[PDB]
Design a protein around this ligand. Structure first.
Ligand SMILES: Cc1cc2nc3c(=O)[nH]c(=O)nc-3n(C[C@H](O)[C@H](O)[C@H](O)COP(=O)(O)O)c2cc1C
Ligand code: SF4
Ligand code: SF4
Ligand code: SF4
Ligand code: FES
Ligand code: FES
Ligand SMILES: [Ca+2]
Lengths: 148, 905, 156
């Protein structure tokens, strides 16, 4: 993208300068916490920070900072290339847009599928994950990771 | 702002957090990670209160009172059952890994964790699993390390790194194996590492020097005293047990030294406990040393003084105001000589003239932390006035404070402040003959000889105001850096100019006065600070008198045939050969001193004076603040034959025995009234502390805690019969626990902090009007002089630049916090921390000499050839040779002298 | 005792170009030294601190805070088997038993020949293909306890 003129100085003739870097971490779960992400980006121990102040006003090196997930920024270009009305007219739920959902652990088809919000967990588990494996009975589930 | 705590309405400061506001109201909230000087971080999670949305809210929410602003209409509950349960739970979680160590822990009885465990009500253990353990580190001679007792409250790293600016202490590791210490074994490098023993709320960091001779806090006899190890006059609580000085605790003073000392004043008390001190008057008769009691010593000394023609008195800046005045009265005003050299005295009286006639307000030590720009001229502040260096560091962090206040971030939210002000800091410009310890935060450092530092100061003054004398021969790059300094100083709202007499140059002080006068002419709120050398240097300067050279001239010419030397070893202010010859010429030498000095071999009478622990008196700050120090203990309580009186008591009785042939052991307030009657510029010392008739509702102030042990056994091995309690006619304090030490008592002299439920140094919160403020009824001490209405003139004696001339070597003074002071370097724990005697040389000069690093060179000064090993100093300038002042064989009077015959041995 | 190589110093300085504060390159500098030497030795902390202009206390605290910055010597290959909940459900304990019985070491230990260092790690982000392992740079998914003695023979 830098060689193709999509990054660096004067992108698309607009005059906007944007430099993108990739910073590979050194293995701590707490580094995903956004204030602790900022602290780890500054080269410190990734202890979190109290809020307020939020990173929007005092974030990375004191400057304003916006921390967003990978999937949110992956959602952004479709919003800006197809419009607002398309994004609110793909799911009849209070949560607009689509989400990468998926069931894991001793199901027939463990994986990941992009589904609209409002999809029930039963139809994910039975149609996309295929239900549980042979000779296993479903006793529990966690909806959104180890912290739920 | 208005807050409602448990239904009770309180009026507080809305700019405070709820923890400091509620502690100021006498409410008890347990806390670990918060400090009044370090701010709030929210680590320990101990200070939980329950906040409600309004008056008609019942469910509430647990908030952390140190991270919650005390805004208007706030509703909190401390004594809510859920808040109490959670605070007990936090104490319990800390207790899960804590070692069973209290009987063998130096913090016991003084432990903030012990206090908060008791306060939360947690005494039942239901944890059955193992405790984590840690290996300890060796942190040097002063601090003992025990990581098992740590509760991971992060106070040590916050203090040592964010506050004291030290770089070798950190936190290592993760989840529950966090380790607070150095990256490897070795001595802690910061000059303020001693305050970790009071910052740490557990026994992880403890006083190793006290651990050698440990006694619990309830067993101490405490007194409010002044530190004697430099001119800053930090308030201390020395505490004794079994007749020896045991510990120096910090004594809170919201105006001077609030929570912190330096390592010299905290750990160099050990000269008091030396076994070779004079404990009895000794008269030399032939080769015999006859021990006398007080009466016959006074009679013999008075007879010898009466048969002599002229008696001269040589004082000291070590001795109190009362002692120096008593010597001045005994020998006469015209016969009284200050014990310092002529050049030292000239620099001292110039510093005094700038302070009390220059029309620029000299700040207190606490107020230094509010200045917007700092210029340090010639003075190695970290090695001579270290608490001024710490206050300078806080003033430098003031810029991040202002930036965070611009974004509506509260003043206690220290992590947000340090994040907003990343590396931005207020301008600091230091000058020295080499590198200093303030170079890490200095915007610029100038390594130059004292003439060139003075010329830089004069040029800064000329660029700020053209009426100041101009400096010719300024290089274009030095002129550019001078313009940088001028732009930083001119734009500051509150500039501060720091200098002192330790640089060894009159012109450095003149340049600092010129910069301050130029800044005052532009209307700036400029302050000036002067660092004197000894504890009572400004008091001896205000008293005045001839130099030591004049006294030696009188002794050598035979015009004086009797010399009384008060608390002076005479070798740190003059050459030893001249002093020895002059004292050997006199037919009477009488040394009134508390330390075995080298001039006692020639002395015909030695009066065993008392040190600051065994005496009362007044000392004057470097800022001109009169401060009383009170006696800690009676030296004769355990050894009945010890005749160790106050110096002024000895000299007043000697004067009375010379006049009316009878001994008169006077009282301290009589001597103070004599001072304020005869010397009108010292009239402020009367109000430094109240008289011996001061009572709190009829009772004296207690020196020892109310649970003092061993009353009928501490002297039983000497005699089973209990002696009389020692009588203190001099002060308002009693040598017992039959007295008052209430935090709500109307006094300002607090011997030690203790409240029921607060046995730690956190007990000081009860003795203060607001936490981190002043003492409840004002700080002790009184300024002698106000800011003058009219200023000085510009000093026009601009020196020429340093010319390195062949054969001569200009002695550049290097100061060390451990070694430059006399009494503290006599203390046996300092020899481990002392630097080796190293003579500093430029690479060019050492290459010219054919000398590398480490080889020993011999040089002759005043007919005395001494040999020292060479250390290469890149920051030094050629033609200069570096010497450590105050060490063995190197008097501080050598600062600015020249050297001859510097050749390899 | 320790001397940084020229390539290490150039990589550290080029990392320092990317950040507003040179302290922000501390993790990458530690990873550069670790990639060059297998682990970060004791003198490397002071060398990195001198290059970056920050105290060695903060570099040591960063090195001991992060689990993938090895402050003790490791083997030539670092096996990292996933510990977390989905690999627990899929049976990482059989994989751990197979690794221990083949290498004759506990987790956190190195074999006598210095060939392997066994380490448990957190989730590897490969939970639908568990149980998961990570030898030095390669992720191996769909593990079975019978595939371990064959999979450890392609790491000499
Ligand atoms: C302990 C902890 C760990 C977290 N780890 C991550 C993470 O690894 N990745 C992530 O995107 N968010 C993580 N978060 C959530 C972030 O704080 C933040 O909500 C998110 O990264 C960005 O917000 P967004 O959802 O609008 O994109 C974590 C939060 C906590 C409390
Ligand atoms: S730190 Fe306090 S609670 Fe812990 S062992 Fe020492 S005295 Fe006891
Ligand atoms: S060593 Fe002391 S001050 Fe430091 S975190 Fe531990 S308990 Fe707190
Ligand atoms: S700064 Fe000076 S007065 Fe204060 S503790 Fe240190 S030596 Fe004593
Ligand atoms: S004192 Fe408030 S959380 Fe530590
Ligand atoms: S649980 Fe093992 S890869 Fe996620
Ligand atoms: Ca007394």
């Amino acid at each position: 993208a830098t060689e193709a003129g999509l990054l660096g100085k004067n992108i698309m003739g607009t005059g906007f300068d944007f430099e993108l870097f990739v910073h590979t971490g050194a293995g701590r779960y707490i580094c995903g916490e956004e204030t602790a992400l900022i602290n780890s980006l500054e080269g410190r121990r990734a202890n979190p920070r109290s809020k307020p102040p939020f990173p929007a006003t005092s974030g990375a090196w004191g400057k304003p900072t916006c921390v967003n997930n990978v999937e949110t920024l992956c959602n952004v270009p479709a919003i800006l290339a197809n419009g607002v009305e398309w994004y609110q007219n793909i799911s009849k739920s209070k949560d607009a847009g689509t989400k990468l959902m998926g069931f894991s652990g001793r199901v027939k088809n463990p994986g990941l599928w992009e589904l609209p919000f409002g999809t029930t967990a039963r139809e994910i588990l039975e149609d996309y994950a295929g239900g549980m494996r042979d000779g296993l009975k479903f006793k529990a589930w966690q909806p959104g990771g180890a912290g739920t | 702002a208005t807050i409602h705590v448990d239904g009770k309405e309180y009026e507080v400061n809305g700019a405070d957090n709820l923890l400091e506001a509620c502690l100021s109201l006498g409410l008890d909230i347990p806390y670990f990670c918060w400090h009044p000087a370090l701010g709030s971080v929210g680590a320990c999670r101990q200070c939980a209160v329950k906040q409600y949305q309004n008056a008609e809210d019942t469910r509430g929410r647990l908030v952390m009172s140190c991270m919650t602003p005390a805004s208007d209409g706030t509703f909190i509950s401390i004594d809510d059952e859920e808040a109490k349960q959670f605070r007990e739970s936090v104490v319990e979680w800390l207790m899960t890994n804590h070692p069973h160590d209290c009987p063998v822990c130096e913090e016991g009885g003084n432990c903030h964790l012990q206090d908060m465990t008791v306060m939360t009500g947690h005494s039942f253990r239901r944890y059955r699993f193992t405790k984590r353990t840690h290996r300890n580190q060796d942190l040097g001679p002063f601090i003992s390390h025990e990581m098992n007792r740590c509760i991971a409250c992060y106070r040590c790293v916050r203090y040592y790194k964010d506050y004291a600016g030290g770089t070798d202490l950190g936190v290592y590791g993760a989840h529950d194996n966090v380790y607070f210490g150095r990256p490897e074994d070795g001595t802690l490098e910061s000059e303020f590492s001693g305050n970790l023993v009071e910052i740490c709320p557990t026994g992880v960091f403890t006083d190793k020097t006290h651990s050698e001779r440990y006694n619990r806090k309830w067993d101490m006899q405490f007194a409010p005293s002044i530190c004697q190890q430099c001119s800053i006059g930090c308030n201390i609580s020395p505490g004794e047990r079994y007749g020896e000085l045991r510990r120096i605790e910090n004594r809170y003073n919201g105006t001077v030294n609030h929570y912190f000392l330096c390592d010299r004043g905290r750990f160099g008390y050990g000269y008091v406990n030396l076994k070779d001190r004079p404990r009895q008057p000794v008269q030399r008769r032939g080769d015999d040393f006859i021990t006398l009691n007080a009466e016959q010593a006074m009679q013999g000394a008075a007879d010898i003084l009466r048969q002599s023609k002229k008696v001269i008195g040589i004082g000291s800046p070590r001795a109190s105001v009362e002692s120096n005045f008593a010597l001045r009265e005994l020998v006469g005003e015209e016969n009284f000589y200050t014990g310092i050299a002529h050049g030292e005295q000239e620099r001292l009286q110039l510093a005094l003239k700038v302070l009390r006639e220059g029309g620029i307000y000299t700040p207190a030590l606490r107020e230094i932390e509010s200045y917007d720009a700092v210029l340090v001229l010639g003075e190695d502040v970290t090695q001579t006035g270290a608490r001024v260096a710490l206050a300078v560091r806080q003033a430098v962090k003031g810029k991040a404070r202002e930036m965070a206040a611009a974004q509506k971030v509260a003043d206690w939210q220290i992590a947000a402040i340090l994040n907003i002000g990343q590396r931005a800091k207020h301008p600091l410009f230091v000058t020295n003959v080499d590198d200093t310890r303030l170079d890490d935060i200095a915007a610029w450092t100038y390594r130059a000889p004292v003439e060139d530092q003075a010329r830089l100061g004069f040029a800064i003054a000329h660029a700020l105001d053209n009426s100041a004398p101009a400096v010719d021969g300024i290089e274009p790059e030095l002129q550019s850096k001078i313009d940088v300094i001028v732009q930083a100083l001119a734009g500051a709202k509150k500039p501060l100019i720091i200098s002192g007499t330790n640089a060894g140059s009159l012109e450095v002080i003149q340049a600092a006065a010129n910069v301050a006068k130029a800044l005052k002419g532009r209307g700036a709120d400029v302050g000036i600070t002067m660092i004197a050398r000894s504890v009572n240097s400004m008091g001896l300067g205000i008293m005045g008198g001839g130099s030591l050279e004049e006294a030696l001239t009188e002794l050598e010419t035979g015009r004086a045939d009797a010399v009384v030397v008060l608390e002076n070893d005479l070798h740190r202010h003059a050459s030893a050969t001249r002093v020895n010859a002059a004292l050997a010429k006199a037919p009477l030498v009488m040394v009134v001193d508390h330390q075995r000095t080298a001039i006692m071999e020639n002395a015909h009478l030695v009066l065993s004076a008392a040190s600051f622990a065994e005496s009362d008196g007044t000392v004057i700050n470097n800022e001109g603040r009169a401060q009383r120090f009170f006696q800690v203990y009676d030296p004769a309580y355990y050894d009945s034959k010890t005749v160790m009186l106050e110096s002024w008591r000895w000299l007043h009785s000697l004067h009375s025995t010379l006049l009316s042939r009878e001994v008169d052991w006077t009282q301290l307030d009589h001597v103070i009234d004599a001072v304020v009657a005869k010397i009108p510029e010292l009239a402020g010392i009367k109000d430094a502390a109240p008289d011996a008739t001061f009572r709190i509702r009829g009772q004296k102030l207690a020196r020892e805690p109310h649970r003092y042990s061993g009353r009928t056994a501490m002297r039983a091995n000497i005699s089973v019969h209990e002696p009389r309690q020692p009588q203190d006619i001099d002060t308002m304090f009693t040598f017992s626990m039959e007295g008052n030490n209430q935090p709500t008592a109307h006094r300002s002299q607090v011997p030690f902090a203790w409240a029921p439920g607060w046995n730690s140094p956190q007990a000081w919160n009860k003795f203060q009007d607001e936490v981190g403020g002043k003492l409840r009824f004002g700080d002790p001490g009184v300024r002698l002089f106000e800011t003058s209405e009219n200023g000085l003139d510009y000093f026009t004696s601009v020196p020429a630049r340093f010319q390195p001339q062949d054969g001569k070597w200009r002695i550049a003074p290097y100061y060390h916090l451990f070694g430059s002071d006399e009494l503290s370097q006599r203390a046996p724990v300092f020899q481990s921390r002392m630097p080796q005697p190293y003579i500093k040389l430029n690479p060019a000069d050492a290459a010219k000499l054919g000398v590398n690093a480490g080889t020993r060179v011999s040089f002759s000064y005043d007919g005395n050839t001494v040999t020292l090993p060479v250390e290469i100093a890149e920051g030094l300038t050629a033609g200069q040779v570096g010497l450590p002042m105050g060490m063995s064989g190197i008097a501080p009077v050598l600062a600015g002298a020249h050297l001859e015959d510097l050749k390899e041995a | 005792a320790f001397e940084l190589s020229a390539a290490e110093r150039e990589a550290i300085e080029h990392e320092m170009h990317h950040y507003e504060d040179p302290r922000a390159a501390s993790i990458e500098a530690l990873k550069i030294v670790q990639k060059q030497r297998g682990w970060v030795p004791d003198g490397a902390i002071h060398a990195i601190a001198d290059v970056l202009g920050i105290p060695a206390s903060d570099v040591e605290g960063v090195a001991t805070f992060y689990s993938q910055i090895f402050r003790q010597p490791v083997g030539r290959h670092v096996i990292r088997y996933c510990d977390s909940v989905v690999c627990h459900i899929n049976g990482y304990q059989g994989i751990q038993a197979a690794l221990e019985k083949k290498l004759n070491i506990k987790p956190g230990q190195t074999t006598f020949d210095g060939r392997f260092t066994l380490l448990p790690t957190c989730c590897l982000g490969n939970c639908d293909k568990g149980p998961n392992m990570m030898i030095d740079e390669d992720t191996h998914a769909h593990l079975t306890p019978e595939a371990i003695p064959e999979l450890l023979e392609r790491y000499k």
